[PDB]
Amino acid sequence: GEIQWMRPSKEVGYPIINAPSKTKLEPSAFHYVFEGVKEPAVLTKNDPRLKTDFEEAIFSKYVGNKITEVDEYMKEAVDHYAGQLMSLDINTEQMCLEDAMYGTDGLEALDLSTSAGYPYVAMGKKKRDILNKQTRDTKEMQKLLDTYGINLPLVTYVKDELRSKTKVEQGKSRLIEASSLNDSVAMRMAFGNLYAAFHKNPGVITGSAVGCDPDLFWSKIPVLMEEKLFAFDYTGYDASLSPAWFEALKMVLEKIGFGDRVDYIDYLNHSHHLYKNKTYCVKGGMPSGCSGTSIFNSMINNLIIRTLLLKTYKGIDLDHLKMIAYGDDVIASYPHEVDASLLAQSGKDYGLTMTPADKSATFETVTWENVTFLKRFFRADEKYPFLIHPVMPMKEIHESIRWTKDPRNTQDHVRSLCLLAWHNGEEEYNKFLAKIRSVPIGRALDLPEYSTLYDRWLDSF
Ligand SMILES: Nc1ncnc2c1ncn2[C@@H]1O[C@H](COP(=O)(O)OP(=O)(O)OP(=O)(O)O)[C@@H](O)[C@H]1O
């Protein structure tokens, strides 16, 4: 990913974008009851915490494009993956605007919360006026589509979230590249069935984990994997992607019945952005807020791992590559051990920066004891080991609970964290509940008891 040019949105007929300059994250009732070291991300150039230019930093993610064409390996990678997907018998038809707007089996309705994007964001018009569940009225949207068309600029916001002190001082705030309700709808109509098939099929055939339910899915994964697990982390995956990987992606879509509209992929690759008062053009890089960012990122990651394997181990049997990805995150396996470090090397050549799994100092042997996926670990239940516990570190929860954006969502926020934490074990969960109930706010929450959660879990399978 790389920015071709950037300039005053006025110089090209685009209005300025008002981006709130103050975070919505303030200390929560449990701020001093739990330990945390994260603070809200820098939102403006002025943040006294900054130690380098904000503009430079928030864009540093676009390290450039490393490859040009789609080589032999990539092509083979494409064939193999496209091969697997073929077996899912994916419906290639388009999705009727209605099902695409309000949802259908395999696809959730649009999220009334997220930005409507341009031009609406600048017109004040919000989704709540265009959509409206009850009737599933296509008319207003249908109208707006003809009126404003598609392939509209991406509105860019700084993501308001908790970050390390380092990523605070270094202005390393993440950015949200929001898509227009139109493009979002168009794409959902174009790929809606692809999206559905993936959500309904997390596993090693789609190589996707998108849509998955950790509480159930974790037990299925170990069975799907091969003997030897191999993993690593990406650094700026999304932004590091080069045009070639997008072309490779289209080659797959094409091979499975979507050549029809692979054009949509072109705007993810080459895209138009509006950030504040400026406008820029990016070559490469997967935008964060588009319909299908997750899935396409996962499909591409599936192409990548195959590639680096075909390029490093001539003769490698891709059919025994069992991997599951969720955007840049991934968990893979092969009958034989492989060198993560070696693969990471071939990676640089493809414009990917790969480092030891979970910020390890070095690439080490991946095991069921240390491997993570979505920050979560794998732990077989003591009483019934054939049931695997998706285990997220308590630290992650402690951090999240020390802050709040809205007091009205405290019940929901804590309840959620509880559904995550209890997997750490009864002793741990109860200490957690104890502390929560050590201040007025918590004592007023409707939190589930361990035994309740654990039994429900057992029956869920
Ligand atoms: N608006 C967004 N919302 C959600 N996720 C985003 C958004 N923008 C980018 N991302 C994701 O976050 C990633 C970057 O997160 P992060 O700042 O932690 O960088 P990192 O590469 O993980 O750093 P490190 O290599 O040191 O671990 C992107 O590659 C992309 O997957």
Ligand code: NA
């Ligand atoms: Na882009």
